Amino acid sequence: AVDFHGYARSGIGWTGSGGEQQCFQTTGAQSKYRLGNECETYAELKLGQEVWKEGDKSFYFDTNVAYSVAQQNDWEATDPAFREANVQGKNLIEWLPGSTIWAGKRFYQRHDVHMIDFYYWDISGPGAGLENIDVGFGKLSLAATRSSEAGGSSSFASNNIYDYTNETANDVFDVRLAQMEINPGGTLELGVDYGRANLRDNYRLVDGASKDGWLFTAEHTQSVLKGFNKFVVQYATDSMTSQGKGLSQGSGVAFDNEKFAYNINNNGHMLRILDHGAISMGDNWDMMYVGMYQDINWDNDNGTKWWTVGIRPMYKWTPIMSTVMEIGYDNVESQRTGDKNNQYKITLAQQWQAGDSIWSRPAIRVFATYAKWDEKWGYDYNGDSKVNPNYGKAVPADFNGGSFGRGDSDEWTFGAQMEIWW
């Protein structure tokens, strides 16, 4: 009675100028338009089981192993990620009917925009929680989750950043109040995340480290046109700004190309306004859309302003065959320099899908993608942090005769790809 679930994507592609497929993402952006822009094959295989059930009480056990290979060969040995292994007991507590007590490594209530493949509320990982408490007007969920950074802690009082190489754990405490009916056909959900860096005994962080941070999020879901529209506003402070999805990095220390610690301090704030949805028009048109503005303002001046606007309409020739288009525009302005790099991508595909909706998966698509970009800044990662004072910092495209970013250019690719979730 094993439950087989998961996700998968894989295909083949060629670049018009020569070589294997190239996937385009403007520097400074944290996401790219996924249709016709997948550089690799990714699978998540989940083998679950309802191991015990009496009346309404039950125990469910779920695993998830993820593989990510480069689709260049048949034998591609990799390091599979044991991403999830957890047990959830449902209806066990009588004082709070309908609630669940869960423990383990879990994909805890991930919110994402599918078109850009961008998670904006994702605190997944090892944790434990009490979920779906009926509080009357809404449903209350409490959770505690763990993250970790490969460095940031020193065993002794040192002023040398190279000494801060010890892995440091972080704790996220999350409380969400969801399903609050405030509108006819529309619901509201609020969420508060507090992230902290849990240091060991006689261990310390670099001076000026954020050491903790906050994340406040509000999301309104409105059901219109046989689809949905989600409008979300998020505000993160300090250690919660490096990732922006709900996990904390309070150390502010990274490992460069040669495994030497260097300062990526993230004191500041981040404001994200997002509106994404899926809409059915007529009996033959479906359309995904996203529009988002994200501003990361850091105290070391390395933040970014990011504008994203994209649509993906699909026309149904037949309950299994459809023609999909995707037009997306990205514009990122640096804080250190002030330069703007932007890109626009147009993808046209013909796809066969197992259903009549834009969300219907087992899909096989033959696509042609065209991206045009210009880029006035990039990140300096040449050499190493010991000899490069600008390592990891945003610098203009021709700083002191360098070549940073992707420049002003244009490219087109094509190929075939399968995508499925089951």
Partner: protein, 105 residues
């Protein structure tokens, strides 16, 4: 000496270490700081890969004595694991510049 000379520091190799205990990986870093007359002229660090420091310091005639300070510090893995580093000896030669036999350009 009545003519300018060259103080050549021959290749000095220093190296740290990395150690994994109970799935936790720790580093022992080797730092070599080289000062000329109190002015920092080299600041090198090593974790696993060896690092080689060799240099030429031009000492002119009449300016005065040249003092080269080599300070080497080793960082421990933890509070109970001593540092495990390596550093070769410091060997310094002094040569003439524009000698008779050898000439380098």
């Amino acid at each position: 000496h009545p003519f300018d000379r060259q103080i050549v520091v021959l290749p000095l190799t220093f190296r740290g270490s990395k150690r994994t205990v109970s799935g936790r990986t720790t580093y022992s870093m080797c730092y070599l700081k080289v000062l000329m007359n109190g002015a920092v002229i080299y600041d090198g660090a090593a974790n696993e890969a060896v690092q080689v420091f060799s240099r030429i310091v031009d000492m002119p005639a009449g300016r005065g004595n040249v003092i080269l300070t080599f300070t080497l510090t080793s960082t421990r893995h933890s509070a109970d694991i001593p540092p495990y580093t390596f550093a070769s000896d410091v060997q310094v030669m002094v040569i003439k510049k524009q000698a008779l036999g050898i000439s380098v350009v």
